[PDB]
Amino acid sequence: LEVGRNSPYDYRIKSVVYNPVNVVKIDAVAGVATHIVVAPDETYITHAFGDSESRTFAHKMNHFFVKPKQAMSDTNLVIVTDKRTYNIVLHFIGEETKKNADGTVSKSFIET
Amino acid sequence: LEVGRNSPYDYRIKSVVYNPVNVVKIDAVAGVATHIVVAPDETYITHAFGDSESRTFAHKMNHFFVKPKQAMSDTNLVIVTDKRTYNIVLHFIGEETKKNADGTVSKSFIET
Amino acid sequence: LEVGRNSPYDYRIKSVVYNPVNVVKIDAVAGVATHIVVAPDETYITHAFGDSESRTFAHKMNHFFVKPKQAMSDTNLVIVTDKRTYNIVLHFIGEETKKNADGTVSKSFIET
Amino acid sequence: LEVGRNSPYDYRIKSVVYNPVNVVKIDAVAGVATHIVVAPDETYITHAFGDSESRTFAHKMNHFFVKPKQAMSDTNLVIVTDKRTYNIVLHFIGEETKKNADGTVSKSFIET
Amino acid sequence: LEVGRNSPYDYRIKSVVYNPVNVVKIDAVAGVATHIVVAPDETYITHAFGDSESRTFAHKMNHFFVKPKQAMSDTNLVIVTDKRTYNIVLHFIGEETKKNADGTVSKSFIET
Amino acid sequence: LEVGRNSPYDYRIKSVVYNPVNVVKIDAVAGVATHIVVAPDETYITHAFGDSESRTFAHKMNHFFVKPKQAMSDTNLVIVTDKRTYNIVLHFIGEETKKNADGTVSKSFIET
Amino acid sequence: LEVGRNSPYDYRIKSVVYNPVNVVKIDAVAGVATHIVVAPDETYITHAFGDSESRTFAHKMNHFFVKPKQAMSDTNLVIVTDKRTYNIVLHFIGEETKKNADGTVSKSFIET
Amino acid sequence: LEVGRNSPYDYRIKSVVYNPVNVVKIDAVAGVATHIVVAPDETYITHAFGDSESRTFAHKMNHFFVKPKQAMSDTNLVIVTDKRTYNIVLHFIGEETKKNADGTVSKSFIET
Amino acid sequence: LEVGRNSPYDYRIKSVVYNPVNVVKIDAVAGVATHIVVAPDETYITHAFGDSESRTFAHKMNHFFVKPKQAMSDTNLVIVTDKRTYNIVLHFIGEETKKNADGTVSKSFIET
Amino acid sequence: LEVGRNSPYDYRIKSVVYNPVNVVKIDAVAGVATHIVVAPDETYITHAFGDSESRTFAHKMNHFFVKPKQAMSDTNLVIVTDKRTYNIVLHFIGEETKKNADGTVSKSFIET
Amino acid sequence: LEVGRNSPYDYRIKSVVYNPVNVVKIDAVAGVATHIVVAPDETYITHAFGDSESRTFAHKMNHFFVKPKQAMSDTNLVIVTDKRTYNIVLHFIGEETKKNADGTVSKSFIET
Amino acid sequence: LEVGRNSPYDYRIKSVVYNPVNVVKIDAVAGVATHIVVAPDETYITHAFGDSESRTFAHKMNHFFVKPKQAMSDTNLVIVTDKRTYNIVLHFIGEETKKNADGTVSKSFIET
Amino acid sequence: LEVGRNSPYDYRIKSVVYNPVNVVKIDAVAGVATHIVVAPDETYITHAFGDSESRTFAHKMNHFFVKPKQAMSDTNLVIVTDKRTYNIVLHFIGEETKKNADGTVSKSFIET
Amino acid sequence: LEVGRNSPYDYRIKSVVYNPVNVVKIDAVAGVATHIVVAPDETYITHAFGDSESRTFAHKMNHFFVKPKQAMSDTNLVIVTDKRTYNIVLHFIGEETKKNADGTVSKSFIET
């Protein structure tokens, strides 16, 4: 939506539709105060993800993973957010009867 | 009715009758704060559907599905709302003794 | 009575007697905020019928049915209200000991 | 009494005695807010009868019946009130120990 | 007493003694708001009798009966009050131990 | 005493002694608001007697009886009060142990 | 004492001693509001006697008895008070242990 | 003491000693509001004696007895008080253990 | 002490010592409001003695005894107080364990 | 101490030491409001002794004993206080465990 | 300490050290309001000792003993305080576990 | 982040990304009021670590270890913070289901 | 510390270190309001010791012991405080687990 | 830190690092209001140590030990604080699971 999403959505909206640049599909298991993830390069300001406070640590490339695992369920929360370029593919299917996490996303993210 | 329906109906009204352009038949299992769906191209503003927060994700065409499934019942909530052109056919028959969902709709939707 | 009946009757009155044009016999199982049905062509404003929120959906002719079924009983609530011309024949006999629904009506309705 | 009786009697009074024109014998099982029945031709304003809200529906002649049946008892509540001319014959004998309904009336009614 | 007796007596008084014209012997089982019966020809105003609200209905002559029967007991409440001339003979003997109804009356009544 | 005795005595007094004209011996079983009986010819105002509201009804002569019977006991309450001349003889002996009713009276009464 | 004794004594006093004229010996069973008996000829005002409201009724002479009997005991309460001349002899001996009634009196009484 | 003793003593005092004229020995069983007995000839004012309200009644001489008997005990309460001359001899011995009544008196009493 | 002792002592004091004239030894069983006994000749004012209200009655001489006996015990309370001259000898020994009454007195008493 | 000791000591003090004249040894069982005993010749003012109100009565000499006996114990309370000269010897030994009464005194006492 | 010690110590202090004149060793079982003992010759003011109110009585010499015995224990409380010269030797050993009374004193005491 | 981090993070943020100089990875089991560790050379101000108050004590080099061990679990909390140069490698894996401590850090730290 | 220590320490302090003159080691079992012991020669003001109020009594030399024994334990509380010169050696070891009394002191004390 | 540490730390801080002069390592089992130990030479002001109030007493050298033993555990609390020079070596290992006392210190301390 805006630069910094800064939003609990509350849930999905009038996603300001775009070309894939500014807006990214931040969604996947989320909630844990993520203003926006991706953009801007200025302070989102920052997010926790996975409704946890774990996140991956090794560096993939320049841009490099993070991956809170939420529950025991499949919780491949990635946010390769370095602030270089940026590729991540989320999916989600936890407690099968959930608040539909099923659909999965991918994020592109140029800052440039 | 108006541009943005913006309404809980409360229930069906003096649907401002038309040619099929502006007003669409948004109805089907609904409730989950859908102002209007379809029109306008300006902010409806947006809807949840299916009284859920699931919705389809793949892209059909340009205009492309979304489909919250409400209950376990037959809940083919489609809103192919892209904002290109637009075709969707809803029907509804859940808990057979319901608040008559039986009758089913179709939506046309040119923005043009 | 008036243009828009706009009334819970409360019950039948000094029905402003007429030729069959303006006033129609709206009666049959009713209650669910029907201001007036039929006339005017301007906003009645609108009615629910059948003390439900079901109503028929196919289009008969131009003017075309609607038919909330109230209970399980015989509840042929028709209001073919299109706003073309208009023919409907109601009858009523539900829970035999009711608040006499027995007598049945017919509605004419020219707007012209 | 007056033009529009407009009265719960409370019960029978100094019935303004007449020739049978203006005043009619409205009595029989009554109560259900009947101002006056018969006269005037202007708004009585209107009555329910039979302490019910049933009334006959077919048209006898121009002037034509109405007949709420009160209880299961003999309740031939007629009010052939069209506002043409007007003939009706009431009688009453319900729960034999009642508030004497026994005596029965007849109504004439010219408006002319 | 006065023109319109207009009185619950409270009970018998200084009955303004007369020739039988104005004052009549209204007494017999009474109570049910009878102002005066008989005279005047102007509004008594009116009476119920018999402590009931029954009264006879056929027309005897011009002046013609009315006869609430009070209880099951002998309750020949007559008031032939037409406002022509006027003859009635009351008697009373109900629950033998009563508030002495035993003595019985007769009413004359010229208005002329 | 006075013209109209108008008194509950309270009980017997300084009966203004007389010749038998004005004052009469009203006494016998009494109480039931008898102002005075007999005199004056103007409004006593009136009495009930016998502590009842029965009284005799036939006409003896011009002046003519009345006779409330109080209890079952010997209760020959007479008041032949017409307002012609006037003769009555009371006696009293009810519940033998009473408030001495034993002594009995006679009333003369000229108005003239 | 005074003209009208007018007194509950309270009990016997400084009986204003006399010749037997004015003051009389009113005493005997008394109490029942006797102001004075005997004198004056003007309003005592009056007495009940015998603590009852019985009193003798026949006429002895001009001056003539009265005799409330108080209890069952010997209660020869006489007051021959006519207001002519006057002779009476009281005595008293009731419930033998009483408030000494034993002593008995006689009354003279000239008014002259 | 004074003219009218007028006193409950409270009990015996500084009896104003005398020659036997004015002051008399009133004592004996007393209490029942005796101001003074004997003197003066003017209003004592009066006494009851014997703590009763009995007193003797026959006339002895001019001056003549009175004799309330108090209890069952020896209670020769005399007060021959006429207001002529005057002789009485009291004694007292009731409930032997009493408030010493034993000592007995005599009264002289000239008024002269 | 003073003329009229007028005192409850409270108990024995600085008895104003004397020659035996004014002050006397009043003591012996006492208490019952004796101001002073003996002197003065003016009002002591007076005493009861013996804590009773008995006292002797015969006359001894001019001056003459009085003798309340207090209890059953030896209670020779004498006060020969006439107001002539005066001789009395008290002693006391009642309930042997008492408030020492043992010691006994004698009273002289000239007024002269 | 002072002239009139006038003191509850409270207990023994700075007895103003002397020659044996003014101050005397009043002590022995005491308490019962003895201001001072002995001196002065003016009002001590007076004492009770022995915590009693007994005291000796015979006269020894001019100056002469008094002797309240306190308890049953040895209680030779003497105070030969006449106000002549004066000799007394007290001792004390009552309830052997007492508030030491053991020590005994003697009193001299010239007033002169 | 001061002239009159006048003190509950509270307990031993900065005893103003001396030559043995002014200050004396008052101590031994004490407490019972002893201001100072010994000095001054002016009012200490006075002491009780021994926490009692016994004290010796015979006269030793001019200066002469006093000796309250406190308890049953060894309680040779001497204070030979005459106010001549003065010798006394106290010791103390009562309830062996006491508030150390063990140490014993001697008092000198010149006033001179 | 800032010079002195001075922060409870609250948890990881928009870590002001850097070259490894200023910001260090302070993280590992922490909480116990660590403002910042490492930088600045000015007052962080200081930290506790390990959520304890233990820390290593020997000196490694100039810059030299500290190592609170938190729980029993693997708690190699090092902070070689001397303020020379600085090398430390943390890791963490305590209660395996923890608040992910798993990922481990390393700190560089030039002050220069 | 100061001249007069005047202190509950509260416990040992910055003992103003000295040569052994002014400050002395007062310590040993203490508490019982000892301002200072030893110095000054002016009012300490004074001490109790031993948390008792016993103290030795004989005189050693000029300067001479005092020795409250506190408990049953070894409680050689000496304070040879005369105010001449002064030697005392305390030690302490009472209830072996105490508030360490173990260490023992010695006091020097010149006033000079 | 400062001259007088004067601090409960609260716990270890930004120990103002030094050469070993001013700041000393006061630590070891402590708590018992130690402002600073060692420096300054001016009033720390003073400390208790060992969370006790024991401390060593003999003099080692000029500068000389003190050693509260805290618990039963190894509690070699030394503070050789004389204020000469100064050497002490603390260690600590009490209740093995403690608030890490394990690490041990040494103190240097020149005042010079």
* Torsion sign (Cα): B91, B93, B94, B98: positive
Alpha carbon separation from B55 to A31, I55, L100 (Å, rounded) = 18, 125, 32
Residue K44 is given by DSSP the state -
Please tell me the distance from the alpha carbon of residue E77 to that of residue E26, in angstroms, as a whole number. 10
CA distances from I23 to G49, I1, I2, I38, I107 (A): 64, 6, 8, 8, 9
Report the phi/psi class of residue I104: left, alpha or beta, with left for phi > 0 and alpha for psi in -120 to 50.
beta
- How distant is the Cα of M35 from the closest Cα of chain K, in angstroms? 11
Residue K54 contacts residue K43 (beta carbons within 8 Å): no
Cα C50 to Cα C78: distance, rounded to the nearest angstrom:
9
| Cα-Cα-Cα-Cα dihedral sign, residues M97, M100, M101, M106 | positive
Under DSSP, the state recorded for F51 is: T
Contact yes or no, C with G (3+ CB pairs under 8 Å): no
Dump the DSSP string for F41-102: SS-------TTSS----S--SSS-------SSSB-------SSSS--B----B-SSSSSS--
N104–L55 CB contact, under 8 Å: no
Residues 6+ apart with CB under 8 A from B19: none
Quote the minimal CA–CA distance from D62 to chain E in Å: 30
Distance CA N6, CA N39 (A): 11
CA neighbor of E73 nearest in space, from E99, E47, E48 = E99
Q: Report d(CA E108, CA E88) in Å as an integer.
A: 7
Asked if the Cβ–Cβ distance from M83 to K17 is below 8 Å, we say yes
Give me the amino acid identity at I48. A
Is the sign of the CA dihedral I12, I16, I17, I23 positive or negative? negative
CA distances from B44 to B3, B7, J13, L52 (A): 8, 10, 110, 56
* Best CA proximity match to H30, nearest among H83, H111, H82, H105: H105
Q: Which residues pair with J93 in a beta bridge?
A: J74
Task: From chain N, pick out residues whose CB is under 8 angstroms from the CB of L83.
Answer: 17
One-letter amino acid of B101 = A
Question: Any idea what DSSP says for residue A88?
Answer: B
Among chain K residues, CA nearest to J17: K82
Dihedral, G24, G27, G31, G36 alpha carbons, nearest 10: 0
Establish whether chain E is in contact with chain J, requiring a minimum of 3 CB pairs below 8 angstroms.
no
F88 secondary structure, DSSP code? B
Q: Residue M90 is encoded by which pair of tokens?
A: 């305390």
Q: Provide DSSP, H78-110.
A: ----SSSS--B----B-SSSSSS--S---B---
Pair of tokens at residue K43: 């009012």
- When CB atoms are compared, the residue of I46, I54, I56 closest to H13 is I46
Q: Do chains H and K touch (3 or more CB pairs under 8 A)?
A: no
Nearest chain K residue to J103, by CA:
K57
Distance CA A23, CA A28 (A): 15
Residue C96: CA atoms inside 13 Å, Cβ hemisphere, count? Answer: 0
D33 contact partners, CB below 8 Å, separation of at least 6: D8, D47, D48
Token pair of B71 as six digits: 């209950």
Q: How far is CA C101 from CA C30, C65, K111, L30, N35, in A?
A: 10, 21, 132, 78, 97
- CA K43 – CA K48 distance, rounded (Å): 13
Write out the two tokens for N31: 């708590």
Residues M69 and M52 sit within 8 Å (Cβ to Cβ): yes
Range(s) of the domain holding residue K106: 1-112
Q: Do G103 and H48 touch (CB under 8 A)?
A: no
8 A C-beta contact, residue I77 and residue I70: yes
- Cα–Cα–Cα angle for D15, D18, D24, rounded to 5 degrees: 65
Q: Other C-beta atoms within 10 Å of M49: how many? A: 28
Only one residue has tokens 């202007």, namely D42
Q: Each residue of B58-96: b (16+ CB within 10 Å) or e?
A: eeeeebbbbbbbbeeeebbbbbbbbeeebebebbbebee
Torsion angle, alpha carbons of G46, G52, G57, G62, to 10: -40
Q: Do F14 and G46 touch (CB under 8 A)?
A: yes
In 3-state terms, what secondary structure has residue K47?
coil
The contact set of L with A (CB < 8 A) is 11-14, 17, 99-100, 102-105
Scanning every residue of chain B, which has its alpha carbon at the shortest distance from the alpha carbon of C42?
Answer: B14
Domains: count for chain L? 1
**Exposure string over D80-104, b if 16+ CB within 10 A, otherwise e:** bbbeeebebebbbebeeeeebbebe
What burial letters (b/e) apply to H48-82, b meaning 16+ CB within 10 Å?
bbbbbebbbbeeeeebbbbbbbbeeeebbbbbbbb
Q: How far apart are CA I91 and CA F15, in angstroms?
A: 75
For the beta carbon of residue C49, count every other beta carbon within 10 angstroms.
28
For residue E37, give Cα distances in angstroms to A64, E29, E43: 109, 13, 10
Q: CA A31 to CA N80: how far, in whole Å? A: 60
CA dihedral sign, ordered K67, K70, K75, K79: negative
CA dist H33 → E65, G11, H13, H46, H78 (Å): 80, 11, 18, 8, 16
**Nearest Cα to Cα of residue E26 among E110, E108, E99, E93:** E108
DSSP state of E107: B
**Tokens 């009644």 appear where?**
H57
Write the CA distances from M46 to C84, K29, K34, M13, M43, integer angstroms. 120, 22, 21, 21, 7
Q: Which among J43, J53, J56 has CB closest to I11? A: J53
DSSP state of M88: B
The chains found to touch K (3+ Cβ pairs under 8 angstroms) are J, M
- Number of alpha helices (DSSP H) and beta strands (DSSP E) in chain B: 0, 0
- Chain I CB contacts of J48 below 8 Å: 11-12
Residue D80: partners with Cβ closer than 8 Å, 6 or more residues away:
D60, D63, D64, D65, D66, D86, D87, D88
The shortest C-alpha distance from B77 to chain A (Å) reads 14
Asked whether the beta carbons of L49 and L66 are under 8 A apart, the reply is yes
Contact A45 L14 (CB under 8 A): yes
> Can you tell me the distance from the alpha carbon of N36 to that of N45, in angstroms, rounded to the nearest whole number?
7
- What torsion do the CA atoms of I43, I45, I50, I51 make, to the nearest 10 degrees? 160
What was the structure determination method? cryo-EM
CB-CB: which of D43, D53, D83 is closest to C11?
D53
Length of chain M (residues)? 112
How close, in Å, is residue K99 to chain M by CA atoms? 7
Tell me the CA distances in angstroms from D102 to D28, D49, E55, E56, one per residue in order.
Answer: 9, 17, 10, 10
In angstroms, rounded to a whole number, what is the distance separating the alpha carbons of residues K9 and K15? 10
The one-character DSSP state at K51 is T
